[PDB]
Design a protein around this ligand. Structure first.
Ligand SMILES: Cc1cc2nc3c(=O)[nH]c(=O)nc-3n(C[C@H](O)[C@H](O)[C@H](O)COP(=O)(O)O)c2cc1C
Ligand code: SF4
Ligand code: SF4
Ligand code: SF4
Ligand code: SF4
Ligand code: SF4
Ligand code: FES
Ligand code: FES
Lengths: 156, 227, 441, 142
């Protein structure tokens, strides 16, 4: 039973002013809805489409293409660990193994209570500063397996 | 208008045309998937590859795509160049890695553009030993059946449905090798010109559901010109 | 090394950087010759004169291809009916091993604002968009604060510095695909479409964003532009006595003593970066191989050091200079595992448009997984060779696939013994069928 | 005494799971030089292609075995049995109930649907040979 809220709708129409076409606001509109609800539900695809004046198959095409826009329910805190080449040399596999022991899940899966979802991600742009991970909008560098339980405790 | 040199021979062609529609008009067989005469050239499938030389004395040139290359005056190309032939065979080989073993129970069998191009390149021996990607299907209404496993990602269906026919309920989803062509959710294709997808799709993804009730192969048909 | 005398003359990009690694705002930026570049441009110089100055200086693109910036800016139409023009700033930075732009936007946000301001006046663009990645959270906070800081000093908006020029700058964060850094696919992502690349010709200088004339430039390319105009074309040419002009953000990452990033002129040799700036390898590690410019470049050896960091010098050594941010591989990394990690990234970051990228690269990944586990068959290495040949330039729709095979073909050439070690099983892709005798080769 | 490869009476065989092996692909009918095979495809609610009728005119048949070698399911096979004879030529026309035998014949183990991508009962998507599981476009993993 999806409805666009009156503040999400005003935020989408705020960014339609900054482009020639309202089609250009589609990425930000998906991120606006996901920021409020954790993920983009199925009824939000038709909701965003009718506001922007583009077909729903165009909105769904964009949302499935982009990795960060989520079309499946996630946890309260998303853990995104780097698995690219410089983090592979600095020991990401030990970080991945420590994350799979504290959480008792596999990447792509959420925890049973729904607190955390574990996802691999590309290079975060922090390659010189060691193995890297992100929890929500927070970047943690110089990762060690011993640091994994204390770091996770902050996010409840 | 223009004169081009193909495989040593010389021909007269229209300069405004690209090299695929020039050479197909002369009876030179070039394999292709993503190009359509009505839809235009986008350059996706990379199957129409020919070797282009800078002049008559250039012996080592480059591979271009004939659907994306203009047939200018002074063009020197070779369809039968060995490096071009190997690459065209490889494109068919890459499409054959994820294709299901479905030709006996595929309604496109005997009328399949992918079957014709696979033979035309001369790729008959499998080297790939790994797993194939699979897709679930959608319900598209009473006219068109859906089998996404047979898709070769030529993008002809979306270019016909959105660009040419101005339909709104078919798109491409996903990324990399997981691209999915269909509707956002199950349901009837809304366009009044949906049924041209059975001819437009070069595989058996979109097939006639009214014909699959009483199916027969194309060679067993009796045809007449009618209105 | 740890003490470096950062001067306005030899370090134009990074001499305003604070020791507490905190950002520099408009009051602090303007005391150390800030926005003085854009004053000399908007009030005294024509748009055409600035473009020739940037052409005379010899500024090259820092995004990984190295095309001339003044030549690209001269591809724009001279028609006066084409009034709507755009300037796009490529702040994507999704290539592994590339952390240079993160330094420039987090701590020196007005540097990019001034650089985009001058470039917009030269290119006559009324609107500018910064195409930032959505992982850079503090880059977006500092950029949006610095835009609003400059909007109240009259350096942005309408009638900038009393001249007729009206420019409005925007920051829009990305949704996380590596192919959005490709310049034609950045235009499609900006338009709100799936980020497929476009075929060239036509070029975005004539037909770009919303069918308007458009120029796409890397962050570090735009930051060089204030230094050129404020000091002069002659200062920039005479920084280094080399065929590549100006300073570059060069660095070393990996298991080295001091991983980091240092502004250096062109023609500095890789050994000087590794052993004087990066402090060499960590203790108990030997040097095995190095990629010069990120993940898309070909691997090079210890013999390929003592060789200058220029585009054509790394080009004649079999590789590409790329982002100029180098990665060191020590003796404990298995080369097959390293390449398998690289190809996994490249395969999954394909946009899916063209067949030899969409379907060729997953085959390479599956072969490398077999090689890493020891299940490789004798025809596997010759397949990897064929994939590299057929994924080269012009055979795929964009440059993603040619960049993907560049580490793969170099690692087979220099480290064939570890790839040959994977081949422990014979060739069989078929199962026996009772009652049917096979065709015995 | 007959050898195993003897080209006598034509039968249709069955799967080791017990279903008829013919998927009504019509390759045997077109590859026959004499034109002695007629058949029509039907489809179950499960989605399995099968022949609605299968008709061989044994008066015309020359026992060349081109039908057997055309078949991509091993359904049609030629058996060592030459014992045929009739008073009427109309009784040389064999229907599917005269041709479908109780087992798999010469090839005991081959099942075509295990190879095929198409989904029928007992084999959903990803349950075929060398086939991975279907990944949805909405999946969180890149
Ligand atoms: C796959 C691919 C990814 C790219 N990613 C980036 C990027 O993240 N940042 C960037 O500045 N250029 C990137 N580029 C290069 C751009 O396409 C383009 O050449 C560059 O932005 C031009 O700007 P410049 O002249 O300032 O270098 C990429 C190119 C390709 C083929
Ligand atoms: S689409 Fe063509 S190649 Fe694929 S199964 Fe059907 S007939 Fe065979
Ligand atoms: S569904 Fe058919 S037409 Fe569309 S991309 Fe796939 S093979 Fe091409
Ligand atoms: S090479 Fe082709 S499939 Fe790969 S990113 Fe470029 S356009 Fe997309
Ligand atoms: S007997 Fe074999 S070839 Fe003939 S229709 Fe049946 S499956 Fe096809
Ligand atoms: S054995 Fe020969 S003649 Fe007889 S049905 Fe088969 S193909 Fe036709
Ligand atoms: S490779 Fe890990 S952040 Fe760059
Ligand atoms: S037909 Fe030319 S590239 Fe597809």
């Amino acid at each position: 039973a999806f409805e666009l809220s009156a503040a999400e709708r005003e935020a989408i129409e705020h960014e339609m002013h900054h482009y020639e076409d309202p089609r250009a606001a589609s990425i930000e509109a998906l991120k606006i809805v996901q920021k409020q609800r954790g993920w983009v539900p199925d009824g939000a695809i038709h909701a965003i489409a009718d506001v922007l004046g583009i077909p729903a198959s165009d909105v769904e095409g964009v949302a499935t293409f982009y990795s960060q826009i989520f079309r499946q329910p996630v946890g309260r805190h998303v853990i995104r660990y780097c698995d690219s080449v410089v983090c592979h040399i600095n020991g990401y596999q030990g970080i991945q193994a420590a994350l799979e022991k504290k959480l008792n899940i596999k990447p792509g899966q959420t925890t049973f209570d729904g607190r955390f979802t574990l996802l691999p991600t590309c290079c975060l742009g922090n390659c010189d500063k060691g193995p890297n991970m992100m929890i929500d909008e927070d970047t943690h560098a110089h990762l060690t397996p011993e640091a994994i339980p204390e770091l996770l405790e902050r996010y409840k | 208008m223009a004169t081009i040199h193909v495989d040593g021979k010389e021909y007269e062609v229209n300069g405004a045309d690209n090299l695929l529609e020039a050479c197909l008009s002369l009876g030179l067989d070039i394999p292709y998937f993503c190009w359509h005469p009505a839809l235009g050239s986008v350059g996706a499938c990379r199957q129409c590859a020919v070797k282009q030389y800078q002049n008559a004395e250039d012996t080592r040139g480059r591979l271009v795509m004939s659907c994306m290359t203009p047939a200018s005056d002074g063009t020197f190309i070779s369809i039968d160049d060995e490096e071009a032939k190997q690459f065209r065979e490889s494109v068919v080989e890459w499409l054959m890695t994820n294709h299901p073993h479905d030709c006996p129970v595929c309604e496109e069998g005997g009328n399949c553009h992918l079957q014709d191009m696979t033979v035309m390149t001369g790729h008959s021996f499998r080297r790939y030993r790994f797993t194939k990607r699979t897709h679930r299907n959608q319900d598209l209404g009473p006219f068109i059946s859906h089998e996404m496993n047979r898709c070769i990602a030529c993008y002809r269906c979306v270019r016909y449905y959105k660009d040419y026919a101005d339909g709104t309920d078919l798109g491409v989803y996903g990324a990399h090798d997981n691209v999915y062509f269909g509707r956002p959710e199950d349901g009837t294709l809304e366009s009044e010109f949906s049924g041209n997808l059975v001819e437009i799709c070069p595989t058996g993804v979109f097939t006639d559901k009214t014909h699959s009730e009483r199916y027969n192969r194309k060679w067993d048909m009796q045809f007449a010109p009618s209105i | 090394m740890k003490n470096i005398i950062r001067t306005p003359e030899t370090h134009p990009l990074t001499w305003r950087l604070r020791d507490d690694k905190q950002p520099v705002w408009l009051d602090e930026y303007r005391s150390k010759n800030g926005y003085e570049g854009a004053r000399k441009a908007l009030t005294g110089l024509s748009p055409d004169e600035i473009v020739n100055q940037v052409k005379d200086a010899g500024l090259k693109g820092r995004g990984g291809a190295g095309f001339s910036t003044g030549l690209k800016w001269s591809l724009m139409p001279k028609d006066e009916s084409m009034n709507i023009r755009y300037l796009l700033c490529n702040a994507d930075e999704m290539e592994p091993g590339t952390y240079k732009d993160r330094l420039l936007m987090e701590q020196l946000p007005h540097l990019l604002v001034e650089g985009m301001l001058i470039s917009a006046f030269a290119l006559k663009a009324y609107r500018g968009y910064i195409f930032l990645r959505g992982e850079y959270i503090e880059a977006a906070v500092n950029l949006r604060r610095a835009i609003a800081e400059a909007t109240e000093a009259g350096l942005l908006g309408k009638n900038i510095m009393g001249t007729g020029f009206d420019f409005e700058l925007f920051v829009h964060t990305g949704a996380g695909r590596y192919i959005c850094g490709e310049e034609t696919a950045l235009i499609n992502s900006l338009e709100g479409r799936r980020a497929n690349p476009r075929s060239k010709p036509p070029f975005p200088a004539t037909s770009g964003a919303w069918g308007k004339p458009t120029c796409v430039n890397n962050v570090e390319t735009l930051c060089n532009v204030p230094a050129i105009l404020a000091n002069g074309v002659e200062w920039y040419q005479n920084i280094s006595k080399s065929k590549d002009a100006g300073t570059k953000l060069m660095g070393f990452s990996g298991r080295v003593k001091n991983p980091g990033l240092w502004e250096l002129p062109f023609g500095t040799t890789a050994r000087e970066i590794l052993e004087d700036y990066a402090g060499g390898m960590r203790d108990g590690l030997k040097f095995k191989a190095w990629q010069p410019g990120g993940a898309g470049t070909d691997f090079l050896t210890e013999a390929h050091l003592d060789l200058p960091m220029e585009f054509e010098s790394i080009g004649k050594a079999g590789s590409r200079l790329g982002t100029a941010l180098a990665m060191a591989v020590d003796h404990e990394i298995n080369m097959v595992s390293l390449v398998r990690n690289l190809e996994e990234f490249f395969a999954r970051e394909s946009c899916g448009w063209c067949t030899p990228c969409r379907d060729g690269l997953p085959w390479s990944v599956k072969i490398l997984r077999a090689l890493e586990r020891g299940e490789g068959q004798p025809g596997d290495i010759e397949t990897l060779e064929q994939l590299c040949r057929f994924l080269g330039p012009g055979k795929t729709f964009c440059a993603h696939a040619p960049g993907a095979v560049e580490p793969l073909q170099s690692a087979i050439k220099y480290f064939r013994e570890e790839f040959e070690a994977g081949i422990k099983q014979p060739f069989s892709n078929t199962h026996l069928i009772n009652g049917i005798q096979p065709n015995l080769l | 005494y007959l050898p195993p490869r003897y080209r006598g009476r034509i039968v249709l065989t069955r799967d080791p799971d017990g279903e008829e092996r013919c998927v009504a692909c019509n390759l045997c009918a077109v590859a026959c030089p004499v034109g002695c095979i007629s058949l029509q495809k039907a489809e179950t609610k499960d989605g399995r292609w099968y022949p609605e009728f299968f008709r061989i005119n044994f008066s015309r048949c020359i026992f060349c075995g081109l039908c057997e070698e055309a078949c991509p399911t091993t359904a049609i096979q030629l058996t060592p049995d030459f014992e045929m004879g009739e008073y009427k030529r109309q009784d040389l026309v064999y229907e599917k109930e005269d041709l479908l035998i109780s087992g798999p014949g010469k090839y005991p183990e081959y099942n075509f649907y295990r190879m095929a991508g198409m989904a029928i009962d007992g084999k959903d998507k990803g349950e075929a040979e060398n086939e991975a599981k279907p990944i949805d476009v909405k999946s969180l993993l890149p």
